[PDB]
Design a protein around this nucleic acid. Structure first.
Ligand SMILES: [Mg+2]
Ligand SMILES: [Zn+2]
Lengths: 134, 102, 129, 82, 221, 25, 82, 71
RNA sequence: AGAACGAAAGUCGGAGGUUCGAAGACGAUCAGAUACCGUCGUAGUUCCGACCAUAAACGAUGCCGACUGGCGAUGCGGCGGCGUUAUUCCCAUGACCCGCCGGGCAGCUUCCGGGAAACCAAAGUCUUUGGGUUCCGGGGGGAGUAUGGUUGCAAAGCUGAAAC
RNA sequence: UUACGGCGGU
């Protein structure tokens, strides 16, 4: 009998989007911010919106919820763009191939242009997983 | 309408398969149409296991199994609910339901 | 049991051009199906073709341009006269501007216009448009 | 696969088809020269042979007929002629 | 790319071989048998890298011919390919769709997620098929980077590289973005591009900040 | 009425009209 | 479309598919027209001009738009010629 | 399918003439037992005498008595 | 035209007769039970010989020929391959593993195309209509009836209308 | 375990 309706949830996700720096993990202060910054037409859904606002205060300070607010979003510009490594994941200059794929680059005239020490395929033909339910 | 692509029966290059008999109503069905179920039930009824190992003549005795292969007519297979009604596009898979033993 | 090798040749070309291909393989050759294809090659509905000659009946590979709609066959070879020839045209041609019923005479395998340019009847052999 | 040039097939697409059905049909068979160990006689047995092949000088058995391709009995010399 | 400037430049083959990019699934598709070289002994279909280079240039020439740069919509749905698809469009100036594709972006004119692009390049033909079957009806040509498993229904310039492993996806987005800028006037063909292909790879889970600071007792402090 | 039990009550009936014709020769 | 008096009596000339020679209709809305922009020979940069190719919706949905524009780009001097 | 070859005009013509005996409008006109049996005997009108004023009940949708005679 | 084979029940004769069991008797169940259910049981189910010739005798889809997508398999031959395993301490042949070829039983997918759609890789290649040929359909009833012929010991089969 | 019917036209 607790479960909050659409108009309470959609009006509280628009608060936390747009006034996130002015909020906190207390109920009685967030009740007063939304009182002063949003036109609520009664007292009952006022603090019922403010309840779900504080519910999202602890919810998004633990991680990236559907959270288009600035600070959680600008911090992932230091993940997609930052961590470019000082040494590459590609440039190791010691990489392995197989005797058939070196024949592929042999007609590409890249046989001796490369270093490319080879590994051999372990000779079984044990692919194509066994059939039937057990 | 033709309801199913096979006609309920797994015969393709045949004209007659053997008639077998259902178990709980003794009705005669074809062998391919029949709804088989092979029960590997332990004969001990697992709540009654610590009452036969504490009254055995050993400390480690592997309990025998009861291997009863039921087979049903489709009439008693739906009534005893071993095959459930399926929707008109979720009929089309031949995989059995998953195990769920624990 | 190939009661008409002409009918099987044209059906194969008709399936492959509506499928969108470029080449076919007509597995029995005949001198009536190379004198059928050079009637539609000279009007420009196919391209080069090559008679792959063997010591039994040969094979033919035809280069399809893509400028073809249907190249059917009239399977009982109904004899057509010059009075009869116009009423065969509006049965099995799409328009009067294009398309040809091709028929064998005493003077050769021809068109409908080539057979009336020369005023000779004959036996209907196929059509293409 | 619309513009597959089916007048000039590759030799490994020509080889992995039926003995019929090719661009030009040809047998898979061959004639083979079999030298027995210990005779001066070249024998010219067919590959898909069907008979108990006997020779003239050392008239022993030389190949066993089977389903497809005749099997030379004892270890004996072999070359594919022409 | 039949020229000599546009040839392979052996240096970058070492980037293909160090990322996957030539190892495909054990089943192959019938419309990709021209791009393949042979099946391995392990069932793996390895791919001709000259053929995936010729399509890479051919996909690049299509995007260069689009005049408005923010008009080649660039899409990725699977997680391996979402960092790559965004800073593709940041570098080359395209317009990205990441995460879930809302059905009708292309075919519905009313809603505010209505884009009208002239070209679209896809990370995966089957796992991102919903823009393929839709972009066929605003008569829009499509590009995919396809592995050997994947159908080629509405794709046109199917790149036969790899779309399973995280290294190979970001590399082919980098390799396409490098060469499509280079057919513009932005790289002068001589020095290698200062952006590193590791920038387009899939992100690690939450241990990121824990490990780099164990070797950063000499940068912050 | 079923069509295999319509066939029976006409097979039972045309052996009854076949027999009265046999009586009144 | 060239009547006997020598004039064009026709609303438009329709495009035809460069892969399969068939007419794109007024509502064959899967048919694309793409541009492949060639580069200058000395340095490899886009020089302003391009090449137009049409693919009809029948041959696109069928699934060989790739083998099409690999075969009429090979035709244009593009690709390996190998 | 049907037999198409040129010279089968005996088979096509003899099969058409005994398949026209399977619809109403040929067989009631060309057999003779459908004109021996109508009371007018192949006529549009006939005279007769009145025997009984009779009333027949209308069909279930309707409920009336139709006034008929017994000519 | 003419023939051969033809499930089950059925018919005739000789063997057999365990179980099952139409008919039948009985006990229940019900308003009534000539039914379901239970106990019993004849003919029959079994074999030999002669008949009868029909079934939802069904893929409800004639037979023959070609052409038109992909894929995973399977059954039988044939060919070729790394390796594992058998007396084998070497071999040839087997068991498995990876392919190709023909034939078959099917399956899975697909805007090949068709369809009234269900669905169909055939029921596709059809108003862009013609590969050969057999059988057969023409609103629902009457009616697979009446009648003539013919077969069968019989039951019945085959052909087969009309008035209305 | 037993559970059978529902006047005609609208
Ligand atoms: Mg019944
Ligand atoms: Zn049952």
């Amino acid at each position: 009998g607790r479960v909050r309706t659409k108009t309470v949830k959609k009006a509280a996700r628009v608060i936390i989007e747009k006034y996130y720096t002015r909020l906190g993990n207390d109920f009685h202060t967030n009740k007063r911010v939304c009182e002063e910054i949003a036109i609520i037409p009664s007292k009952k859904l006022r603090n019922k919106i403010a309840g779900y606002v504080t519910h999202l205060m602890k919810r998004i300070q633990r991680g990236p919820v559907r959270g288009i607010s600035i600070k959680l979003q600008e911090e992932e510009r230091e993940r997609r763009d930052n961590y470019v490594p000082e040494v590459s994941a590609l440039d190791q200059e010691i990489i392995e191939v197989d005797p058939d794929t070196k024949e592929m680059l042999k007609l590409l005239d890249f046989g001796s242009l490369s270093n490319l020490q080879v590994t051999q395929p372990t000779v079984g033909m044990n692919f194509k997983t066994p059939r039937g339910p057990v | 309408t033709k309801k199913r692509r096979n006609n309920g029966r797994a015969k393709k290059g045949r004209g007659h398969v053997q008639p077998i008999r259902c178990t709980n109503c003794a009705r005669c069905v074809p062998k391919d149409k029949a709804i088989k179920k092979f029960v590997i039930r332990n004969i001990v009824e697992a709540a009654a296991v610590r009452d036969i190992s504490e009254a055995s003549v050993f400390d480690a005795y592997v309990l025998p199994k009861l291997y009863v292969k039921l087979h049903y007519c489709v009439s008693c297979a739906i009534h005893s609910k071993v095959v459930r009604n399926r929707s008109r596009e979720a009929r089309k898979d031949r995989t059995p339901p998953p195990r769920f033993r624990p | 049991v190939r009661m008409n090798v002409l009918a099987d040749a044209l059906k194969s070309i008709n399936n492959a051009e509506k499928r969108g291909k470029r080449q076919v393989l007509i597995r029995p050759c005949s001198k009536v199906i190379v004198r059928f294809l050079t009637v539609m090659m000279k009007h420009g509905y196919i391209g080069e073709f090559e008679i792959i000659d063997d010591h039994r009946a040969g094979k033919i590979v035809v280069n399809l341009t893509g400028r073809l709609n249907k190249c059917g066959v009239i399977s009982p070879r109904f004899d057509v006269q010059l009075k009869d020839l116009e009423k065969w045209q509006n049965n099995l041609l799409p328009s009067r501007q294009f398309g040809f019923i091709v028929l064998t005479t005493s003077a050769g395998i021809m068109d409908h216009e080539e057979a009336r340019r020369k005023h000779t009847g004959g036996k209907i052999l196929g059509f293409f448009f | 696969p619309l513009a597959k040039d089916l007048l000039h097939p590759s030799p490994e697409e020509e080889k992995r088809k039926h003995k019929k059905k090719r661009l030009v049909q040809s047998p898979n068979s061959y004639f083979m020269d079999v030298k027995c160990p210990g005779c001066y006689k070249i024998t010219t047995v067919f590959s898909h042979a069907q008979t108990v092949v006997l020779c003239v000088g050392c008239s022993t058995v030389l190949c066993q007929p089977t389903g497809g391709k005749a099997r030379l009995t004892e270890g004996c010399s072999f070359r594919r002629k022409q | 790319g039949a020229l000599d400037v546009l040839q392979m430049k052996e240096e970058d083959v070492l980037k293909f071989l160090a990322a996957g990019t030539h190892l495909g699934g054990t089943n192959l598709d019938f419309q990709m048998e021209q791009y393949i070289y042979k099946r391995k002994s392990d069932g793996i279909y390895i791919i001709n890298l000259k053929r995936t280079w010729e399509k890479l240039l051919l996909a690049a020439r299509a995007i260069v011919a689009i005049e408005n740069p923010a008009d080649v919509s660039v899409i990725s749905s699977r997680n391996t390919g979402q960092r790559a698809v965004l800073k593709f469009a940041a570098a080359t100036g395209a317009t990205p769709i990441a995460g879930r594709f809302t059905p009708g972006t292309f075919t519905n004119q009313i809603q505010a997620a209505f884009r009208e692009p002239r070209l679209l390049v896809v990370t995966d033909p089957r796992a991102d098929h919903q823009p393929l079957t839709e972009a066929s009806y605003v008569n829009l040509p499509t590009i995919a980077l396809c592995n050997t498993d994947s159908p080629l229904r509405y794709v046109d310039i199917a790149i036969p590289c790899n779309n399973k492993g995280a290294h190979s996806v970001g590399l082919m987005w980098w390799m396409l973005a490098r060469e499509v800028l280079r057919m513009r006037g932005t790289i002068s063909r001589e020095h290698p591009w200062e952006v590193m292909p590791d920038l387009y790879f899939y992100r690690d889970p939450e241990e990121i900040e824990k490990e780099e600071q164990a070797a950063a007792e000499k940068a912050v402090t | 009425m079923r069509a295999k039990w319509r066939k029976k009550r006409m097979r039972r009936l045309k052996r009854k009209r076949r027999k009265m014709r046999q009586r009144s020769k | 479309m060239q009547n006997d008096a020598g004039e064009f009596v026709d609303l438009y000339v329709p495009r035809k598919c460069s892969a399969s020679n068939r007419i794109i209709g007024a509502k064959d809305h899967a048919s694309i027209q793409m541009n492949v922009a060639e580069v200058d020979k000395v340095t490899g940069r886009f020089n302003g001009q391009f090449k137009t190719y049409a693919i009809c919706g029948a041959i696109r949905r069928m699934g060989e738009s790739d083998d099409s524009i690999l075969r009429l780009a090979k035709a244009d001097g593009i690709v390996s010629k190998n | 399918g049907k037999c198409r070859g040129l010279r089968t005009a005996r088979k096509l013509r003899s099969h058409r003439r005994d398949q026209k005996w399977h619809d109403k409008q040929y067989k009631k006109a060309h057999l003779g037992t459908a004109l021996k049996a109508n009371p007018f005997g192949g006529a549009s009108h006939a005279k007769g005498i009145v025997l009984e004023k009779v009333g027949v009940e209308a069909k279930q949708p309707n409920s009336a008595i139709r006034k008929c005679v017994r000519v």
